Amino acid sequence: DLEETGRVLSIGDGIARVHGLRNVQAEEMVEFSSGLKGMSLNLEPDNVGVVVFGNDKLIKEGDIVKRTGAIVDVPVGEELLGRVVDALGNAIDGKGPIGSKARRRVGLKAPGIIPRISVREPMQTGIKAVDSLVPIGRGQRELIIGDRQTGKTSIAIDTIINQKRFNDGTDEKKKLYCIYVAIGQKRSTVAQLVKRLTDADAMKYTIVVSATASDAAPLQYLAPYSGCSMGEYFRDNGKHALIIYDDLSKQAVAYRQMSLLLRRPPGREAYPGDVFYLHSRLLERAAKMNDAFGGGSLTALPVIETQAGDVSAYIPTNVISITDGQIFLETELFYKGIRPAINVGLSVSRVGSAAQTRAMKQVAGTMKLELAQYREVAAFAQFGSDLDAATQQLLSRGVRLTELLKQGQYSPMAIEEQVAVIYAGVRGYLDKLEPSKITKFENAFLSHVISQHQALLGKIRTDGKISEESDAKLKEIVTNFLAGFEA
Amino acid sequence: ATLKDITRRLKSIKNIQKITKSMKMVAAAKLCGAIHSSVAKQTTSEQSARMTAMDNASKNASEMIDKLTLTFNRTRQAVITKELIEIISGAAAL
Amino acid sequence: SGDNVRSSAGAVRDAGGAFGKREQAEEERYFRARAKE
Amino acid sequence: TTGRIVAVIGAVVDVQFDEGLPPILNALEVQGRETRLVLEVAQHLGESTVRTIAMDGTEGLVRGQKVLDSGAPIRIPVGPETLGRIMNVIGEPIDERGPIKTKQFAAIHAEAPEFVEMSVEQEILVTGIKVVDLLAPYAKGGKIGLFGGAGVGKTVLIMELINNVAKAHGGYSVFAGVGERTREGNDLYHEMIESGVINLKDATSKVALVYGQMNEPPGARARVALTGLTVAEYFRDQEGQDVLLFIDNIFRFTQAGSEVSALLGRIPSAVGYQPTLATDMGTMQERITTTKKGSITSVQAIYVPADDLTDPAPATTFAHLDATTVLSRAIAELGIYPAVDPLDSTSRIMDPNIVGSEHYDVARGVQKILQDYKSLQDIIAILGMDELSEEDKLTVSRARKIQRFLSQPFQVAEVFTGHLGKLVPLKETIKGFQQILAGEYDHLPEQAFYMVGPIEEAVAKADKLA
Amino acid sequence: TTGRIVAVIGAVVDVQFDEGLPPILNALEVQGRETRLVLEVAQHLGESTVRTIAMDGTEGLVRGQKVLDSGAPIRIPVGPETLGRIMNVIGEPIDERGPIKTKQFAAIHAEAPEFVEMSVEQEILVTGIKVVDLLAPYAKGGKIGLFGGAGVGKTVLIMELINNVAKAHGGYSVFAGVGERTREGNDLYHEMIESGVINLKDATSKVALVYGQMNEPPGARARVALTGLTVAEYFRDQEGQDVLLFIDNIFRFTQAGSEVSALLGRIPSAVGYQPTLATDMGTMQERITTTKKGSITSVQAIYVPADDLTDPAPATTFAHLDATTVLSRAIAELGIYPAVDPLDSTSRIMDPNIVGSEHYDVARGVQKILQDYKSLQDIIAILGMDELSEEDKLTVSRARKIQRFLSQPFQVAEVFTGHLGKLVPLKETIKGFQQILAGEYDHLPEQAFYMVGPIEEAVAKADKLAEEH
Ligand SMILES: Nc1ncnc2c1ncn2[C@@H]1O[C@H](COP(=O)(O)OP(=O)(O)NP(=O)(O)O)[C@@H](O)[C@H]1O
Ligand SMILES: Nc1ncnc2c1ncn2[C@@H]1O[C@H](COP(=O)(O)OP(=O)(O)NP(=O)(O)O)[C@@H](O)[C@H]1O
Ligand SMILES: [Mg+2]
Ligand SMILES: [Mg+2]
C-alpha cells in the first residue's frame, strides 16, 4: 500500500528518502520500522524526503514508513512546569512521566493583527540596565545578542529568577510563567542551568526544553516551536509566558544541515532560502493578546551569537529585523568592569516607555539624556588635562551612573528597588563619592531601604511616579545615609 | 586586503582620530608642528600650531577612515560573494 | 576597540618603543635605588 | 482546468495539469483547505508540469491534491471601498470588517505604461511641508527614499503627507507594508484611526492598507508591493488622481525577492542577491510614474545594509529615486519637527529648469547658510562667540531663524499637540525663507519662527511673545 | 554477510550487498589485504549499495572485492590492559608490543549519556599555572578547552597539564592523538616512559594511548577521537574511578570530516565545512563528559585556522567547554608564556561563591587594569609616556608587571626557555597578584616579575637584578 505506508530508498545524514506515502501531508510525522519519528519537509514526485528525529543507525534501506496522521504535537499545560523535556515533550529528568492533560500542534499559525493590542504591561527583567534603559513589554520579542561568553544567557536566567517575586505573589495578573528553550547546548550546561533555577526555586514555574548537541538535527529545529507552543497554551488562557530560545543561531545551523542534506538550494552562508521564513513564523508567534482573547501574552527572548560582533551577517540580520528590539552585549565593556555588559547606546527597545511605569519613566529619561551627553565627551576623558567645568561635570555623572548599572547575576530587583537606586544617582548624590565605591554604596544603600523603608518603595509604585512627598522622603534618606557612608 | 586586517586598521585609526580631535580642543583651550622645530634648528604660537596640527591630523585620519571603510565594504561584499560561489560550485558538482 | 592601535604596526612599534624605552630607564632608575634601600 | 499537486518542497510547489496548462504568473487555487492557499505560477517545467511559489503555508498539502487554474494572475479588489480597509496579499480583508464589496478586480501583474503614455513634464508634488517642498521637492510620479529608523516622526510624516496630498490634491493613498511586523502593523492601523486618515464609520478614509507580515512566506512578502501597487493604479488610471504610494521598507521587498529566487534554486549574483535584482526592481518601480491620466508618487522607506550605500539592494534602489527624505534623531532632539535633515535630504528635480530659478536660489541659500552655521559651531564654542564679525553674527542668527522656521506643526498632531496643524503652499515657503535670507525679519526673536505655518504667523507670534 | 566493492573514490568506497545490507556505522572488513582494512557504513545509497569511509588507505582496492560485515560498529579493546599501550583507530596495537589481549571490546560509536545522568558538582582543579588558576580556573572532572592558532603553545601547554596534573593523579589517564604530528607521538611516548607514567615491564602504567595522526587519511582521523573517547569511557563507567582525557586537537575531527564531505555527496556549507559540522561535533562532545557514574577531566587542544576564533570549527567548540584558555599570537610574540589571553580566557567556576570573594576580586581586578592598559595603549601610541596623569601612568606601570607575572616557566618547557620550571600554589598566586594590585611592588622593576614562580622569586630576582647593576 504505497498510499499510507512507504519503504526507505536511501538513508543518509538524517535524511531518509522514502518511496510511497503518496498520502502524507507536507510537514507530517511518520514512523520508521525502528519506531523513530520523522518529519516530511520535501514532497517529491518519485519520493518523499523525510527528515529523521534521532540517530539514523536504526534506519536501513527498505524499512517501512507508515503515516502517523497525528501531526507533530507536544504536551502543554502547567504539568510541564518544573519539568525538563526534549524537543518533543518527552520527559528527560527521570522525575517520572508528565500529566499530559492536553496537547498542542507545534506548527501553528500565529495570531493575526486584530487579536492583538499594543505592548503596555511591563516585563520586568530585574536588571537595572534593561528595565531602566531597554524596557520590555509583555508580548514583546526582544533579542539578546553579542559575542560568545558575553552574558547573553545571564540576561535570561536572572529575568526568570526575577519572576519569583511576582510568582509567589497574590497579584495573578503580574504572574509570568517561563520557558527556557535550549538549542544545541550540551546536556552538561543545561543541568547546571536547571540546578540554578532550582536552587533559586524558580524551576517550579519554569519549563525547560532541551535539544542538546547530540539530539538529531530536526529535534533541535523543532524545540524552538514545540517550545513556543508550550508558551501559547498560557498565551491563549489569559496567562502570560516568557519564552527564551537560546541561540536561534544554532537552530538555523540545524535547519541548514537538513536542507543541504536533502539537497535543497543553498544560498548566502549555504543557508536555505526560507531560513528567514523559519524565524519569522516563530518570532511572530509571540504576542500581547487582547482582553477579548483573554489578555494573555507570549513574550519572546531569542539569543543570537554573533561572530566578532558582525551583526551585518545573514542570520543576525534576519532576526534583528524580525524582532522588536536589541540588548547588545560586549566583551570590552565586560573585562572593563561594566557588568552586565550592555551597550546603552547600541541596545534599543522600540517599545520603550510603553512598558515602563511612570515610577521608572521619570528617573530613566534624565539618566538617558545624561548617559548620552557623557557618551560625547567620553574621549576627552583621560586627555582632558584642562577640561572646562562643564565637561568635567559631564564625565563625572558619566562614571557614576554606569557603576549603578552594575548588577549581580542571579540577582534581579523589583522595579521600585530599582528606581530607588537610580534616584540617588540621577539627583547627583553619588557625584562626590569616589568611583570605585559607588558599587559598595548601592549595595549598602539598597539593602537598607528594602530593610527599613518598604512602604516608601510601595509609595513609589502606587503613586505611579516620584511624588512630591516621596521625592522628599528619599532626598533625606539619601543625604543622611550618604553622609554616614563616608564617615 | 583582508577583512581581519582592514577591521584592525579602521579601529586603530578611528581611535587615533578620537584622540587627536580631543588634543585639538585642549590646545584650543590653552607635538606643536614646526614650532620647536624652527627655533632649535636656528605660547600664543605654540598653542596656535598645536591647534592647527591636531586639526589637520584629525582630518587626515577621517579622510583615511573614509577610505578604509569603502575598502571595508567592497571587500566585505567580495568575501560574501566568494563564500557563495564556493558553496554553489560544490553543489553543482554533485 | 580598546587597544586597536597596538594590534597593528606603524604606530604600534612606536607605542611599543616609547613604552619599553621608558620603563627601560625608569627601572634602571629604580634599579640602583634598590641598592640604596 | 484542474491540476494535481505532484511536488511540494517548502514554499515551492509543482503542479501537473493534464490538459490546459496555466501561464506564468497565473494564480492557482489549492483545493481542500480551511483558508485560501494561492500558488502563483513561476515556471513551465515541461511534461504538463508547472512550478509555483505558495502565498501561504504548504503544510497539509499532499501529492495529488486538486488545484484550480484561476485563469489569470492574482486578482484583488480595487476601487474606493478598499480605502480604510486592510488588505491581504491576495486581496482578502484582514481587518475583519467583513468583505470588501467592490465591483472591480485587477491583476497584481501589469506591464508598466508604454513610452507614449509617458509624461515629459517635470512637475513638483506640493506636500505643504516646508523643508520637503523647499529643500528636497517630491517629484510628482517619482520615488523618494525615506531615511530614518524609528522614533523620529516617521509614522507622523507618513500620515500628514496622506492628509496634505488629500486636502491639496484630491488623491488617495495606499500603504504597502512589505515585511511589516504584525505588531507595528497593528500600531499603525490605530495610530492612523486616531489621526483621521482612517475612519471606521463614515467613508472619509484617505488611505488603503496592504500588508505583508514577516510571518508570511517570501513568496507572499514579495508580491505585496505589487498588490498594494495594483490598488494605487486603479486611482490613477480610473479616477485620474495623483495617488501616493507608501512602501515601508523597499529593502524587504528586495530580500523577499532573493528568498524566492533561492527557493527556486537560481544562482545568486554578487552579495547573495538574485540575478534578477534589477529587473525585479524594474518591473515594479516602473509602474510608478506620471501618466497622461494622472500620477503616482511613492515614499519608500529604505534600509542600507551594513550601512553600505554600495550594497546591491540600495544601489539598485537609488537608480529609481528622485528624492530622499532623511529623518534625524539629532534633529528630533532639538525639538525640531519634522526631524527632516535640511542638508542630507535632497532632490534631482531641485534644478532651475524644473523648480524655477527663483525657487532654486532660495533652497540653495538656505542650504548654504546652514552649511555656514554648521561649521562655525567649532569657533563659537572654543574661540568663543564674541569675536564674530558682523557677517558672522548675522549668519548664526538668521540660520537659527531659518533652522527653526523649518519646523512645522502637523494637522495629524492636533490630537495630542493641541495646536492647529498647518499646510504651507509652495508660494508661502519660498517667500518666507526668501525674506529671512534678506534680513527683513532680523528684528524678531527665534521662537517666533519655531512651530508655525506661513511667514505671517512668525511675526504675529513675535509680538505676542513680545 | 559478504559484499563487493563497486566504487572507490578516495576515502569514499561503495560496497554492494546482495544478501543483507549492513546498518549504518557498521564496520566492514575488506578481504584480500595484508593489513586489516575497515570500512564504516556511512550511508544507504539505495539499490542494495552502501557508501563507506575507509579507516585506512584505499591504494589497491579492486572493484568487486569482497567485504565481510563484522555485524557491528568499530569495536576496540578497552580496559586496564590498554594502559601503556599505543592503540590504533580500529583497536589495533601500534607499539609493536604484540596484541592487546582484552576481555571486553566496546563500540567507538554509542549514544551520549542522558540528561538525568548529568552531574552538577564543580570543584576547582588547581594546576600551578598562575594565569589559569587565577583568571579561568579549571574544574575537577570538567571539560577543558585549549584554543590557539598555529604554534602559540597548545601542545606545550597540554604537556604541562600532564606533567603537573596527570603525574600526580591517583588514577588512569587517556591520551588520543588526533591528526597531529607522529613525531609528537614519539616524544610523548618516550617522555612518559621516562617519567614512569608508562611501564613496559609490568602493569603500573596509568595512561592509554590512541593515535591517528597526520599521515593518516581523513577517515581515520575522523574516528580516532571517538576511539580514544571509548577507552576513557570504560574507565569512567566500569569503575567510576577518576579519569583524565587528553585529546591533542579535536579540530582534526572536524577537518577529517571536512575532507570527505563532498565525496559523501553533500552541498558544502559556510567556509567549506560540512553542513553536519555542529551536530557531528555534538554527538562527539556530549560523550566526553562527567556523569553520575564517574568523572572525566578532559583537556582538549583546539586549533584555530589562521588564528580566527570566529571560524566555524572553533566557534562551535566553545559551548562544549566549562573552562577555556585561549592562546594569543600577540601575547606569545611579547615572549609571554603560556601565551594565555587574560581578556579572552574564561571559566564557568569563575564565581565568587565558588572560589570565594578574595580570589574573584583579584582576578577581575587583574582583567580590569589590563583592559584599562589596553585603552592607554592607544592614547600613549600618539602622545608618549609623558602625558598620563600620575594616576594613569601608574596603572600602566602595574599592567606591565601584572602582565609579566602571568608568564611562567614550565617544567615541560625547560628545553625551550632554558630556565627551571616552577609550580605555583593557588593561594601564593592570589597573594602574588593581590599585592601587585595593592601597589606594594611599585618600587620593583617589571623584569623582576617575568618568568618566575611565587611572588617572592620576583623580589629575589629583583634583588639579584639590583646587585648586578
Ligand atoms: N552581572 C554579572 N556579573 C558578573 N558576572 C556575570 C554577570 N552576568 C554574567 N556573568 C558571568 O559571565 C560569564 C558568561 O556569561 P554567560 O551567561 O554564560 O554568557 P553567554 O553569552 O551565554 N556565553 P555562552 O553562551 O556560553 O557563549 C559567566 O561566568 C557568568 O557568571
Ligand atoms: N611554554 C612555552 N615556553 C616557551 N616557548 C613555548 C612555550 N609553549 C610554546 N612555545 C614555543 O612555541 C613552539 C611550539 O608551540 P606548540 O606547543 O607546539 O604549539 P601548538 O599550539 O601545538 N602549534 P600547532 O599544534 O602546530 O598548531 C615551541 O617550539 C616553542 O618555541
Ligand atoms: Mg549561553
Ligand atoms: Mg600542536
Q: Which helix (H) or strand (E) holds A180?
A: strand A176-183
- Answer yes or no: do B73 and D310 touch at CB < 8 A: yes
Q: Which residues contact A351 (CB under 8 A, 6 or more apart)?
A: A119, A135, A136, A137, A140, A324, A325
Q: Which amino acid is at E43?
A: Q
| 3-state per-residue secondary structure call for D199-233 | CCCCCCCCEEEEEECCCCCHHHHHHHHHHHHHHHH
- Nearest to A232, CA basis, from A180, A277, A179, A164: A179
For residue A46, the SS3 value is coil
Residues D247, D239 contacting (CB under 8 angstroms): no
d(CA A405, CA A422): 9
Selecting among E167, E181, E393, E431, the annotated active-site residue is: E181
| Amino acid of residue C24 | Q
Q: Distance (Å, rounded) from C-alpha A45 to C-alpha D465?
A: 80
Task: Give the residue carrying C-alpha cell 525674506.
Answer: D435
Pocket test for ligand 1, best of A143, A148, A149 (most atoms within 8 A of CB): A149
From CA D26, how far away is CA B78, in angstroms rounded?
37
Chain A residues with CB under 8 Å of B19 CB are 379, 383
- Contact (CB, 8 A) for C12 and E450: no
Chains C and B touch (3+ CB pairs under 8 A): yes
Is E265 close to B94, i.e. CB distance below 8 A? yes
- Helix/strand/coil percent split, chain E, to 5: 40, 20, 40
In contact, D428 and D384? CB cutoff 8 Å: no
CB neighbours of residue A265 within 10 Å = 22
Q: Cα(D275)–Cα(B84) distance, rounded to whole angstroms?
A: 13
Q: Give me the amino acid identity at D3.
A: G
**Chains in contact with E, counting 3 or more C-beta pairs less than 8 Å apart as contact:** A, B, C
* Triad E416, E420, E425: Cα angle to 5°: 120
Smallest CA separation from ligand 1 atom 15, residue: A151
For residues D183-219, one letter each, b for 16 or more C-beta atoms within 10 angstroms of the residue's C-beta and e for the rest, the string is bbbbbbbebbeebbbbeeeeeebbbbbbbbbbbbbbb
Residues A378, A373: Cα–Cα separation, whole Å = 9
**Phi and psi at residue D122, in whole multiples of 5°?**
-100, 90
CB neighbour burial string for A340-362, b if at least 16 within 10 angstroms, e if fewer: bbbbbeebbbbbbebbbbebbbb
Q: C-alpha distances in angstroms, D279 versus D39, D254, D261, D275?
A: 22, 11, 12, 9
DSSP E67: E
CB D125 within 8 A of CB A143: no
C-alpha cell at E19: 544478501
Interface touch B84/D272, C-beta < 8 Å = yes
* Residue carrying the nine cell digits 552538561: A188
Among A13, A55, A310, most E C-beta atoms within 10 A, so best to mutate, is A13
Answer whether A touches B (≥3 Cβ pairs < 8 Å). yes
Secondary structure (3-state) at A436: helix
**Cis before D113 (ω within 30):** no
Task: State the closest ligand 1 atom to the C-alpha of E350, by its place in the atom list counted from 1.
Answer: 29
Q: CA-CA distance, E20 to E26, in Å (whole number)?
A: 13
Q: Which string of b and e fits A428-460 if b means at least 16 CB within 10 Å? A: ebbeebeeeebeebbeebbeebbeeeeebbebb
- Which run of H or of E encompasses A231? helix A217-235
Query: Quick check: CB of A149 below 6 Å from ligand 1?
Result: yes
Strand partners, E87: E93, E210
Stretch 5-24 of chain C: residues touching chain E, C-beta under 8 Å: 5-7, 11-12, 14-15, 18-19, 22-23
Cα distance between residue E309 and residue A147, in whole Å: 11
Place of cell 560625547: A376
Q: Which of A155, A96, A91 is closest to A123 using CA atoms?
A: A155
The CA distance from A458 to A420, in Å, is: 11
Q: Under 8 Å CB-to-CB from A412, ≥6 apart: which residues?
A: A124, A125, A126, A127, A158, A159, A161, A162
Length of chain A (residues): 487
Alpha-carbon distances, residue A109 vs A112, A228, A229, A257, D35 (angstroms) = 9, 12, 11, 25, 11
Mutation choice for E interface testing from C4, C6, C14 by most E CBs within 10 A: C6
Task: Return d(Cα A51, Cα A37) in angstroms, integer.
Answer: 9
Give SS3 for E143: strand
**Which of A45, A18, A46 lies closest to A31 in space, CA to CA?**
A18
Cα Dmax for chain C: 43
Rg of chain C over CA atoms, in angstroms?
14
- Spell out where A271-395 has E strands: 287-288, 297-305, 325-329, 348-349
Strands E172-178 and E207-212: parallel
Report the separation in Å between the CA atom of A189 and the middle of ligand 3, taken as the mean of its atom positions.
Answer: 9
Instruction: Report chain B's terminal Cα–Cα distance, integer Å.
Output: 32
Q: Which ranges of A3-127 would DSSP assign to H, the alpha helix?
A: none
Residue type, A333: L
Domains by residue range for chain D, with CATH: 1-73 (2.40.10.170), 74-349 (3.40.50.300), 350-466 (1.10.1140.10)
- Nearest 5°: phi and psi at A256? -55, -50
Fill in the DSSP letter of residue E69. E
D376 contacts D392 by C-beta, under 8 angstroms: yes
User: Rounded distance, CA A88 to CA A69, Å?
Assistant: 16
Q: Apex CA D458: angle with CA D456 and CA D464, to 5°? A: 110
CB under 8 Å to D20, separation ≥6 — which residues? D1, D69
Residue of A155, A156, A139, A141 whose CA lies nearest to A405: A155
- Helix H or strand E encompassing A32: strand A29-32
In chain A, the domains with their CATH numbers are 1-70 (2.40.30.20), 71-356 (3.40.50.300), 357-487 (1.20.150.20)
Active site residue A263: no
Starting from the CA of residue E412, give the closest ligand. Answer: 2
Which among A120, A148, A350, A375 is annotated as catalytic? A350
**The 3-state secondary structure of chain D, one letter per residue:** CEEEEEEEECCEEEEEECCCCCCCCEEEEECCCCCCCEEEEEEEEECCEEEEEECCCCCCCCCCCEEEEEEEECEEEECHHHCCCEECCCCCECCCCCCCCCCEEEECCCCCCCCCCECCCCCEECCCCHHHHHHCCEECCCEEEEECCCCCCHHHHHHHHHHHHHHHHCCCEEEEEECCCHHHHHHHHHHHHCCCCCCCCCCCCCEEEEEECCCCCHHHHHHHHHHHHHHHHHHHHCCCCEEEEEEECCHHHHHHHHHHHHHCCCCCCHHHCCCCHHHHHHHHHCCCCEECCCEEEEEEECCCHHHCCCCHHHHHHCCCEEEEEEECHHHHHCCCCCCECCCCCEECCCCHHHHCHHHHHHHHHHHHHHHHHHHHHHHHHHHHCCCCCHHHHHHHHHHHHHHHHCCCCCCCCHHHHCCCCCCCCHHHHHHHHHHHHHCCCCCCCHHHCCCCCCCHHHHHHHHHCC
Closest C-alpha among D441, D442, D444, D438 to residue D465: D444
State the amino acid at position A88 in one-letter form.
L
Q: Is A412 in the pocket of ligand 1 (CB under 6 A)?
A: no
Question: What burial letters (b/e) apply to E363-389, b meaning 16+ CB within 10 Å?
Answer: bbbbbbbbbbbbbbbbbbbbbbbebbe
Q: For C31, which residue in chain E has the nearest alpha carbon? A: E466
Burial class (CB in 10 A: 0-12, 13-18, 19+), B46: middle
